[PDB]
């Protein structure tokens, strides 16, 4: 009976890490012994190391997370997609944690209930990427979302954090009741929640004009719950502004963490799945208009983090491409891209929450950056150029790969928006550049140095970035097999 | 409850026992699985005393951060134990003890 | 008819949920419990055809889901609270800083 | 509401659910037509694609 | 599908969907499979019984 | 018929929820819509969650609402619109909505029209699944907590998230 | 790949005018609810209805009027011509979008811009 | 000055930043910051979805994918 | 069987008609308190507790060891929460 539970081994250590972490952080803040200390950077530092040791239990354990799969078989299933989407998981978390020791002690953040519904959120995650049925997905996804919520007005007496978490949870559960109901329309019309059995009633045939609509409307509302999950226009308009309001660290876990778990959901549930290409023409057509909004609202942002914001909405555009065309390439391409926009989002942030320190709010803030933090200045840059897809950086494979489904799936007007916004992306990320290498600002501000941290992760990123080209072989292939996990 | 441990993936090695017990596995311990246990229990505590200091409590820091890591050091020597015994890693010191035995 | 009944009942329920949210644009309140009568209206499908198929997959779900809805509800009224705490009045001209 | 205009609107209600009824039985005894003009249209468009695969 | 029934017993419509997931499990071409993959789904909604009644209903009233 | 008296009831409690000036008043019709459920889930023969839909979503979760909007004191000029000007825009999506989703099931599930002729004779019964009977509640006790106890677990750790956000966001210690 | 249809100019006009005037209706409602109302019309219900309702009638009317002559001066060219292209319909398109608005928007420049854009969109068509 | 300075101009570099930030300007004007407009836009999304993927059937019959397009490039200039 | 339902609904509209009578017959002749929210959601958090102990009671004679465990489980997490509404002063009105 013991030997059952070796498949969900990292996800008992977790858990139960983080049971021990917040009776730690509730015992001694309360203690007037210790004079109420701020537990937030202690129980932090011990629940990077828990991240860390589920990662090692996970990584090292490869072939036992199968064991028993029968008998787990109507609750998740674990194979080697999973296996490496949760290994990437487990590393965005472990990466973001280590970003928040400056934030927790020079803010004074005190809360260690922060680092403690992190953790639960990725245990939560953890399950949405072995979820196997539409009841394990929606309950993972919800405890994902409810952390989120949280987290996001963990600043309660700030206009901005209460406005960011009350607009997050009204938006996010109009979006969970749609995709609830999706859900409830595809078990009425099909009696199954369980992916194989819905992969088994759906396929052969996708509408043979005696279409079932309960099954096309359930996987309408799934779709439009999995849209606004991964900010996708037209179920984007939340993500700015729960960006921007939300703590800084929080604005950084969510660009990255939470679109890895959902594209793992997406793969599973339709890929896995069988339909017409309706569903293709949803995520094409989402696609498009998330590139144009996404390019045109970067293009008028003054401020960096909703500058971020609008162009994660981009990059997810770009990303989505690969999910319509359908073929082993596009979700290849999909993973390359989501990976590679992972490590230049936390490159990015890193950059962001070491300029906090000195409260970094406008471009324009950034001005004389060359002359009072020249290396710093350089790293940024670097970034900025990734990020509008110039080789030989690695940011240039979105770009590359957008183009090739393109002139290959026959597509000429997803080329012609492709050339276009990524001009706009050009212009409005070399705008950065500018502002700190070409004006001549009267006034100056003088950052505070980053800690040893973010400095490590910016320096490792940064070489990642601009030498990754040169030996990519590791990611294409892991990619590859990846994708070939979902079918076979 | 029907239980059933059949794997996905088959083992890869000479299957020594299908279903281990918990002290058959633990018993299987070798000085590897030892030296894994105490050496993420080691690191643990140090992190617990060393992020403990700036509050104050490096003392019950260290407790807590060595209650994690010697959970999570049994559960990975208990899982290198248990996958040699069921040939998912390579066991070729279980099966010696199991020919000869 | 009786299913057809039932599911127009749920159908009902379903879209006054969308109307509040149409219809209370000055009244967050209002429509943190339209998407409550959202939620309701999906639990009674999952009931209604798990009678309606013989399955109990549906029932299982609709406690879940009730679990769900309770939390949602809970961490909903404290965010609704200390908004209003921090400004001291519920009207959306006050939650609407951020934009652009 | 005044009680008795809440009465008058269950009233109203229970008027409209009724022709809802009207309305659900109307659509069942329209199942053979629909049926049949469905099968007239796949003939149509087998036929043509039958006659274009010749070519 | 799950066989789960909701008065503690294996469900009405569990052995169609068994016949179909065993046809299924061998069967590459999912057209081969058609007659009971729509024999549990009219176990599931009963569409044609309940049409065909209904034909039976309409030539009553026609000839009344 | 019942059916369309429990659906009447439903739907003006409703409209009563999305359009009362007052969000107590709101709140005091929303129990009127479970209670109507909750009728529902009888007729469906589910006792154990027509009784647990007044336990929960009137016993604990309206409580809630109705403690919170009460101490709120909110003042009619801060929430109050005219709603005539959406007449229009929810006539057409209400109208879209319905057509498309009020018959959802009619083609797949086809109704069977009440003819003039006793079909409650063939009826055909069964006495083997009548010998020993369980109740919707040992049937979901069966399931629960064996079969399917992971999603239970993360259920609770959905509330204990629950527990842990309300004190954080709202505690304020004398 | 197009042989779905019974055609007819006058009925493709009249059909295209009816289909505008639905969508600007539509487009003209969702706008209407999108904007505020004035602060002198927030206690009185009646005025911001009617304002809605001439909102969906005059977006209705103007595309209406897009709908119609786009089809009617494409199906008129292309048959004084008798050649199919598309070249007959970017007249059209030019046409429709140059007169009408630029009779709404009151300019030469809008009406030369918004013909060029509607050229283009039916050129990709 | 014609052409250069004019023209070339006018149609390329000039024209074509003030243009975009116009609709930059526009579309950030989107993003209102009222919680209302982005749960609309949600149900506006959510029923232009309906709408195209199902109820495209029997609208064929008095529409023209040509005029669809039309519509929507033309509502770009109003007001 | 549903059938006892029926006499509980004769019962309510009985007594609604007695209330009505009894209550009838004489026309002839702005403080914030965070705690009560508070004590709502914990009352919502151990409804919830005893709601999923009903089926588990009566079902205990089947699910047998695995069974207890699992609800066994399910207890700690929430009491493990409930410590932490203990030691945070949720529990104290003075």
Known sequence: MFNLFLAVFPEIFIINATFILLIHGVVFSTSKKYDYPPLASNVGWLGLLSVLITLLLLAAGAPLLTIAHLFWNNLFRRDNFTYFCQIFLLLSTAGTISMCFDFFDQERFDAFEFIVLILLSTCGMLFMISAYDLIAMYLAIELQSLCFYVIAASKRKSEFSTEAGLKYLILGAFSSGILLFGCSMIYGSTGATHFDQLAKILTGYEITGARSSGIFMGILFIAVGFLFKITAVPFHMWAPDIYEGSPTPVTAFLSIAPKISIFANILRVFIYGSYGATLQQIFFFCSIASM???????????????????????????????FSCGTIEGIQSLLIGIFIYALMTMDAFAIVLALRQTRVKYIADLGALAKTNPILAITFSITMFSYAGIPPLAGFCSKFYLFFAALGCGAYFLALVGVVTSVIGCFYYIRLVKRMFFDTPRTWILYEPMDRNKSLLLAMTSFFITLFLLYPSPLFSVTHQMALSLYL | MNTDITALEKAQYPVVDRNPAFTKVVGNFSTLDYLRFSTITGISVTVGYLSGIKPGIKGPSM???????????????????????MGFFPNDGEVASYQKR | MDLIKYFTFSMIIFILGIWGILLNRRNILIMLMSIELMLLAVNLNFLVFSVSLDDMMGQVFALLVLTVAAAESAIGLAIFVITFRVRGTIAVEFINSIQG | VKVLTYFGMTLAAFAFWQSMDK????????????????????????????????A | ASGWGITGNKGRCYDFWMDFSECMSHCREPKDCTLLREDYLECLHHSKEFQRRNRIYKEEQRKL | MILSVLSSLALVSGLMVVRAKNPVHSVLFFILVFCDT??????????????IFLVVYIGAIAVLFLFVVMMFHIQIAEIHEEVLRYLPVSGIIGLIFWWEMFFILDNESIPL???????????????????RSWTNLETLGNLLYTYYFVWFLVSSLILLVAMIGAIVLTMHRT | RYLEEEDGPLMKTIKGSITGFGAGTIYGTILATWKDVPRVERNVALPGLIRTLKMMG???????????????????????????????????????GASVLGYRARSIPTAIAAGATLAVTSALI | EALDKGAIEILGPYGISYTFRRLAERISQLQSGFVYHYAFAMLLGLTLFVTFFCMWDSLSSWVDNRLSFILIVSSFYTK | MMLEFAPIFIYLVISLLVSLILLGVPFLFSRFDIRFYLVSILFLIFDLEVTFFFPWAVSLNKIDLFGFWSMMAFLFILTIGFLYEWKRGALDWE
């Open chain 1, 292 to 322: 144009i909004l996404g390019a045109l609202a970067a293009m008028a942002q003054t401020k960096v983090k909703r500058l971020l914001a609008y162009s994660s909405i981009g990059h997810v555009g770009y990303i989505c491409i690969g």
């Open chain 2, 63 to 85: 407790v807590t951060g060595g209650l994690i890591g010697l959970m999570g050091g049994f559960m990975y020597a208990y899982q290198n134990s248990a996958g040699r015994l």
């Open chain 4, 23 to 54: 309305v659900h039985v109307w659509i069942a005894l329209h199942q053979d037509e629909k049926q049949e003009r469905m099968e007239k249209e796949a003939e149509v468009r087998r036929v043509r694609a039958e006659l274009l695969r010749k």
């Open chain 6, 38 to 51: 909750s009728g529902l889930l009888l007729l469906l023969g589910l006792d154990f969650f027509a009784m």
């Open chain 6, 113 to 131: 029209l009440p003819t003039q002729r006793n079909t409650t004779s063939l009826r055909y019964t069964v006495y083997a699944g009548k010998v």
């Open chain 7, 58 to 96: 005059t977006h209705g009317l103007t595309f209406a009027a897009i709908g119609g002559v786009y089809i009617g001066v494409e199906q008129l060219v292309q048959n004084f011509r008798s050649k199919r292209d598309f070249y007959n319909g970017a007249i059209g398109g030019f046409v429709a």
